[PDB]
């Protein structure tokens, strides 16, 4: 069994490198962030441009949705995160505290908290309602490449160029576990038992969190430079999805570790991929020679 992702839409409009694409939890929208300082909202199913959300003074490296699909958070080189009302496009809160570029962000499942990672080497936990910083974790000794909450928000996982992945107790801010090439991306599996980690030696690893053991390795792609997003595809077959510095989207069989598809079409590094929550749909986005988002559809 292999997927058969085919190109459905090319989304043009960002004037510099795209940095991150994320599907709304309700499956309706794609949000994109860019070095052009803009967030753009697109129809997930028809690829139709919806709106531009603006206000950051420098490039945006990441964007994330609240669980109810009503809010976005963005992470910017202007050293702030911003919370946006998607319907109005208005900035509700500017989260101030990082002393350098904010690189990565995510809401917890409740969406009362935001976690951020920065070049300042810290992870911050923010109150969504007040916009106040609740905790500053001295998480790493180099830029923080990724931050993600587990399924119930009890844990945070962070990755860094220092070569560490760390698991934090959300409530206390205390480090429960440390798992050395730079770690360029990390996220929990949907069930929260595993962590998917990218290292800048062209390697993805599936870690059993509780055991601290490497279960799977995915190779064949190019990743020596950029913090490329990877995903668990769960809507059809159980795949691993990642961009690559050879301008392709890679899809592996999670269990066998075999490459089952490579998606051709991008004309620069595929920095970000996202899996639709209910349909067999991938969004991919590329750096400044390309600046487009592609939507792909598969039968499985
Ligand atoms: C400038 C390109 C940034 C892309 C990016 N990758 C991640 C992984 O967490 C966050 N942002």
Residue numbers in the entry: 31 to 209, 214 to 334
Excerpt from the publication:
A “cellular multitasker” with many binding partners, the scaffolding protein WDR5 is best studied in the context of histone methylation as part of the SET1/MLL (mixed-lineage leukemia) complexes. WDR5 comprises a 7-bladed β-propeller fold, each blade composed of a four-stranded antiparallel β-sheet (the WD40 motif). Cavities on each face, namely, the “WDR5-binding motif” (WBM) and “WDR5-interacting” (WIN) sites, are the interfaces key to its scaffolding role. The WIN site is dominated by a conserved arginine pocket, where the guanidine headgroup sits in a “phenylalanine clamp” composed of Phe133 and Phe263.
